[PDB]
Amino acid sequence: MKITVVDLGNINVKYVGENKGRFSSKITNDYQSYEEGFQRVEYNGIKTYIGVGELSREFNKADRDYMAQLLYSLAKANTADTKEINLTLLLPIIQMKNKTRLIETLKGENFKFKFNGIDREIKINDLMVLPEGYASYYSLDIENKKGDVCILDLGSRTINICVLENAKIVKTNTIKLGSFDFYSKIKSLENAKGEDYIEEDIQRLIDNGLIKVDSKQYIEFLSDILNAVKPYVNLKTYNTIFTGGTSLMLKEYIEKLPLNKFKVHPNALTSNVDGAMEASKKVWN
Amino acid sequence: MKITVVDLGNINVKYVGENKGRFSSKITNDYQSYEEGFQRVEYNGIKTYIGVGELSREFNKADRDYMAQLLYSLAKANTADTKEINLTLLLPIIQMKNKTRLIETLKGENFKFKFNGIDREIKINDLMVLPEGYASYYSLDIENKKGDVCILDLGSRTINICVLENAKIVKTNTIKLGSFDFYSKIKSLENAKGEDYIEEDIQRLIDNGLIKVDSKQYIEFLSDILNAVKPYVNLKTYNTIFTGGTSLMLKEYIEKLPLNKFKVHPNALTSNVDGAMEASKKVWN
Amino acid sequence: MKITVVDLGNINVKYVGENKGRFSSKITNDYQSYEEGFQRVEYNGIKTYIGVGELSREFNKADRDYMAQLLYSLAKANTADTKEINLTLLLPIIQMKNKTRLIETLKGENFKFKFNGIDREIKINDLMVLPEGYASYYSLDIENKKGDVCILDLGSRTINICVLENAKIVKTNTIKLGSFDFYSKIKSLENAKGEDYIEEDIQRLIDNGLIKVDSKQYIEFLSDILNAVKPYVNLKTYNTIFTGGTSLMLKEYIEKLPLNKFKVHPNALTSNVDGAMEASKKVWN
Amino acid sequence: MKITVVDLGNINVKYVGENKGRFSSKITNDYQSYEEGFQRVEYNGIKTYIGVGELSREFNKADRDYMAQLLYSLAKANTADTKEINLTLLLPIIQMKNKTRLIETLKGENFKFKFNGIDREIKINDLMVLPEGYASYYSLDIENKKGDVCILDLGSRTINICVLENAKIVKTNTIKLGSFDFYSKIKSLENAKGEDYIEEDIQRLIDNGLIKVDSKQYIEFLSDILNAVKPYVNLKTYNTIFTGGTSLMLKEYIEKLPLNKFKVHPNALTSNVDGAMEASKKVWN
Amino acid sequence: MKITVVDLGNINVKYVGENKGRFSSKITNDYQSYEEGFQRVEYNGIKTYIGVGELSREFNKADRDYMAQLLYSLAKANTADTKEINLTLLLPIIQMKNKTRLIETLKGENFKFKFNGIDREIKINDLMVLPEGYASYYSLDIENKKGDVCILDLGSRTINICVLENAKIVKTNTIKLGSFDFYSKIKSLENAKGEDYIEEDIQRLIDNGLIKVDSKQYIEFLSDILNAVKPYVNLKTYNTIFTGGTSLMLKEYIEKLPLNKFKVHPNALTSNVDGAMEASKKVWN
Numbered sequence A, B, C, D, E: 001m002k003i004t005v006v007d008l009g010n011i012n013v014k015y016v017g018e019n020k021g022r023f024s025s026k027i028t029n030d031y032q033s034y035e036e037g038f039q040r041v042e043y044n045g046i047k048t049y050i051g052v053g054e055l056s057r058e059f060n061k062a063d064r065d066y067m068a069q070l071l072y073s074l075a076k077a078n079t080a081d082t083k084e085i086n087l088t089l090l091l092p093i094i095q096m097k098n099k100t101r102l103i104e105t106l107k108g109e110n111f112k113f114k115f116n117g118i119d120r121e122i123k124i125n126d127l128m129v130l131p132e133g134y135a136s137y138y139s140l141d142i143e144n145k146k147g148d149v150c151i152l153d154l155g156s157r158t159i160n161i162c163v164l165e166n167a168k169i170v171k172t173n174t175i176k177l178g179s180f181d182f183y184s185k186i187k188s189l190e191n192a193k194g195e196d197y198i199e200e201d202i203q204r205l206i207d208n209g210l211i212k213v214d215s216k217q218y219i220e221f222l223s224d225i226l227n228a229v230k231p232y233v234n235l236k237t238y239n240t241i242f243t244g245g246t247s248l249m250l251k252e253y254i255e256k257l258p259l260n261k262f263k264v265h266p267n268a269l270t271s272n273v274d275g276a277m278e279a280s281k282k283v284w285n
């Protein structure tokens, strides 16, 4: 029957199915008087509002109340008439060792919710769990997988690397660095200029032209990440597919790099689960 | 059919419809011999005179006989020939959790009154309830909502803050501080000068030139409110729309602030329900 | 030395000391030819007759010539041989902010009077001022103050509520409703039956059987007061002590209520200053 | 010279010095007519009454007018003859990052107050700030710190965990769960039974026998907290010291647990600052 | 001038100089609110806390942020008044091919740090790099180096073997086996007994008597390591010096072996850099 794919992401939860899209992993459970003015869900004795509050930073999100965001994203991907669906969840690569913990709350059960009053329940056909970032592989045709590839997801705080040969994997790694670190570095001196910004509001300010982050600072970040990744891979080799939002930060200068074969694929942020959807096709079809 | 908007306000009830305007939330039910000389309404076994008496200070006005002022304002907004009307009531933000209590007396019923002898009854088409101060949002065009905004209502005893991103809310808060507190502070030493004034008569005395409240005291109040609001928002960010009467107190020096983008919108006191009227247009139209 | 307690009440002045009792707060200063036939006092350039005239309704009785009734009650509580006495006056709860005004005429002075010719003067040992209705607390033993309590004085036009935990207060409030309002409601249709009664003569007529106020109307008043008081207190909780004359109106059906723990204490009308006398014992002894 | 310790707590402020004790963090600043009947303090342009009003729930109490309760507790711990004192304040663990904000109002200054009229001022010798819950450590002798320990404070809405090896810390964490949540869960169905209770009055009702919360519900809460805490610690390991009021809720069944080494220490609620006092001894002595 | 020796070890960093000692290689860079309660260093844009967090297991520690622990150990070995020092670093034997990478960050430069606020900088006189485990050689006198020797370091996950003839080396090898593997084997069935232990906490539990690892299991590990090492060396020949912490695990039964000449030297864990210090004496003196 019908299938959906869900990416829990590093800062944004995201979904594809009969309904497709994304939203921030942002969450709150604090004081309230105007519930109607916020996206909200109450279930399992927990009340939450979605897309606002605190973003959190603790490792292994699977252990700190991910459930509300997960079910909210499921409701988004689904329509009110959905009977039952298959599940292809995704986790940050180095974290899938926690899948069993997820299996505690997830494996082949049925779930109830309210989410503003739509408030129905649904069972899941089956369960698969995959690495975040990696799935990009299956969105690719043989157009470039005819040669060796490197899926490279520039996640908010991380870079997720998996180098693959014919049909198969060759190596994997994670580096704890990301555009959030760049925002922190920028604020280390921009806040010092009599301001009260944060790593969360910053991007909107670069968008509106209120702030003038220098062009060469993005280049500094690019060089830093390249230096970090050198010991494992040759970027010139292993044609690299950039994915994630940070690739959307840096496309304009990634394109300027002297590398041999590479690209920032369209919807690079959602390319991983474009590939996960192709992998789902492979699984069922 | 036709619609009206009503703001219960902090010190003044106010209305817009086929008739528009405002008046103080002031009320009495005390001894009387010249009923004809006072605005008055008798209903539900309660006799009241409007715009005079005691202003009251208790929290949750919804529980201390708001009904007379509400129906009086309805009669003002309506004309004697009105058949039936839709309702868009407003409450102080942190107070809409009491809407259910309001729903006890209000939801889709018909109401009778006397009010000096016009003395007819009317049914209401439907019910919506909204936050006071917030509705300003919908009076704005994309002229400045293209960027992030902050509705900022300097209510008599409070400041009501709601920061909004595209089409949507980002955060909300209230601070229990207002021009009434400034009047109390001024009287803490001005009354001490062998006088018997109050926070109610004071503004008329500054108007007539009888009193000489220093210019820098308004600046002190501005700095106090700015210090109070800092922990949640950056004023330079989130282009701020000042609303409420206190904005009318301080316009002349608000305009002098070093902030980047901001304004005290025309009819700032009634701008919130200018926006509520735009929101009503959005609802029905 | 010896002490007295005085309750100014809502309709009746009242006293306890070497002489104890009560009488209406009724007063006149109008035309006269048979002074000997009326209780009377002339002092401070004011001539008054006690227990007859006009009852008055204005708020803050402390500002409209309470003095004659006060001194008359003092004379009642005292004997002609009294040298000097301590004072424990009482005010309606929300009104003790006017104590300073009372201190203008009262604090530690000596007073002269005539009152039909007894006509002596007396000084007062000291001054304390307490809330009317509340003092009931100290008449109670630990017999029921071992648990949480609620002093509930059903005064002529009001209900005075104070909820107390161990030895201490928890909350307080007033509601402007009373048996006078019930009498007004009854006369709203009973006078309409070609009669000229008032809220003052009515109770005598129910006493003599001339009038047949329905039983269920007292129940309607009970339900109205219960609905009014709900937002602040749980009647089932906070064992309630009914006090005041209206409790004497309603005892027969108060006893029928489904509440858990409660009572209409003996001399409920004077129970408050039974407790004030116990509090005086606590003060001096 | 002399030193004092103050715990701001989650629901109760508390103090030890020449005077020792505790009281609720409850506070009000609302309407008043009988100031003498309430604990009260007026300073810095703010009037407050202590131990009554609203308990508040917002995070980072350091930003919402904690000052009145703090100074009130200082006055309690001190005597009218106190010259100057050292300060060892405490904050909820995850919150001490706000100490700088506290340093804005506190570091080595002198403070004035009224508090019913005692109304003097005092300077502070020095400043230290410590984690709430943790300080229990220093009340322990080597009697059980010879082995690894776990300070475990079951605070009103939280559980505060710090696991310590020889003389030192090993790990720390907070879980947003507490007896307040249990009271909310109990009221989720007990209020539904035609009652108007809250999480605040409930404990008094279990105390008086009016309510019959089932024994197994406390066990359910115990199991829930144990499940929550498992991912970080082994309870059988790291001999656990239960602290806080909730430990006083659950002692009777905590003692029944199958764990190896543990205890609910005497005055578990105040054991943390018993240890903070021992730590003060260590600091100065 | 003065010299220091540093062992990066397998689980513990360690140092000798004007200050001597050791500590775990344990490290974290995660969320924080009580910096003062943890050993910490912030430099080169990286914030870390020492002796707690994650121990890590990846090969070639030189590539995964060893810098914080290294500089922390330098600060330990040095005093606040140190001007400049010589450097004799050590690496796991098979890893010194990475010395050039170390030379990228280390060779004859000056370094800055904060480490809780001491926060000074220092230059290094010169650079030497040596094998971990081997240096034990130079702590020995001719007391037993008159004959052939075998330095044998039973490191946490490894055994490091170097067989030496007169003044010189004869052969070298590493075996990937260690007491960490023994702890993993023990937990393979001890955790299975309804417990949540790890290879890190285990040794403390054997220390406190909570756990009863059988005596013969240490013998099994001894036999396994002996079988592993046989193909290269004769233990009876090449008088063996046991070094490292695991030798401290097994001394009591190592002494029982039927071998001809051998010993577990005092401070076997630090004997290697006792010898490295002797080698430094040889170098400069």
Ligand SMILES: Nc1nc2c(ncn2[C@@H]2O[C@H](COP(=O)(O)OP(=O)(O)OP(=O)(O)O)[C@@H](O)[C@H]2O)c(=O)[nH]1
Residues within 6 Å of the ligand: A008, A009, A010, A011, A012, A013, A025, A154, A155, A156, A157, A178, A179, A180, A203, A243, A244, A245, A246, A247, A248, A249, A269
């Ligand atoms: N320009 C632009 N950037 C975006 C947009 N949405 C997200 N981003 C960027 O995404 C970056 C966050 O890091 P990511 O690369 O997305 O990390 P991640 O692992 O993919 O985590 P997720 O965003 O949840 O998928 C930030 O720098 C954002 O600016 C967008 O709509 N436009």
Ligand SMILES: Nc1nc2c(ncn2[C@@H]2O[C@H](COP(=O)(O)OP(=O)(O)OP(=O)(O)O)[C@@H](O)[C@H]2O)c(=O)[nH]1
Residues within 6 Å of the ligand: B008, B009, B010, B011, B012, B013, B025, B154, B155, B156, B157, B178, B179, B180, B203, B243, B244, B245, B246, B247, B248, B249, B269
């Ligand atoms: N100058 C001037 N000030 C006004 C007028 N009407 C009201 N105000 C001011 O309004 C202030 C009261 O505080 P507000 O900002 O109005 O508080 P609010 O929440 O908006 O409550 P409402 O007045 O009922 O809408 C007082 O300081 C008044 O002086 C006016 O016609 N002229």
Ligand SMILES: Nc1nc2c(ncn2[C@@H]2O[C@H](COP(=O)(O)OP(=O)(O)OP(=O)(O)O)[C@@H](O)[C@H]2O)c(=O)[nH]1
Residues within 6 Å of the ligand: C008, C009, C010, C011, C012, C013, C025, C154, C155, C156, C157, C178, C179, C180, C203, C243, C244, C245, C246, C247, C248, C249, C269
């Ligand atoms: N049955 C009866 N009722 C009385 C008597 N004296 C006073 N009352 C009642 O007292 C009621 C007046 O309201 P109260 O409850 O006394 O109000 P209050 O605040 O106590 O004012 P005071 O009467 O002055 O103490 C009236 O309904 C009277 O009928 C009495 O002797 N017998």
Ligand SMILES: Nc1nc2c(ncn2[C@@H]2O[C@H](COP(=O)(O)OP(=O)(O)OP(=O)(O)O)[C@@H](O)[C@H]2O)c(=O)[nH]1
Residues within 6 Å of the ligand: D008, D009, D010, D011, D012, D013, D025, D154, D155, D156, D157, D178, D179, D180, D203, D243, D244, D245, D246, D247, D248, D249, D269
């Ligand atoms: N039985 C009993 N319980 C108490 C008493 N005082 C407080 N409590 C309990 O304390 C609990 C509140 O949670 P706490 O564990 O105290 O949370 P906290 O972090 O310590 O906050 P504080 O109470 O201010 O110290 C409630 O369940 C109360 O019932 C008491 O005197 N007797």
Ligand SMILES: Nc1nc2c(ncn2[C@@H]2O[C@H](COP(=O)(O)OP(=O)(O)OP(=O)(O)O)[C@@H](O)[C@H]2O)c(=O)[nH]1
Residues within 6 Å of the ligand: E008, E009, E010, E011, E012, E013, E025, E154, E155, E156, E157, E178, E179, E180, E203, E243, E244, E245, E246, E247, E248, E249, E269
């Ligand atoms: N009994 C005891 N054992 C210790 C002590 N310190 C470390 N150890 C042991 O050291 C062992 C770790 O393996 P090692 O032999 O030290 O491996 P390594 O290559 O020397 O790595 P380092 O410990 O960092 O020097 C563990 O089994 C620990 O129990 C100690 O103070 N007492």
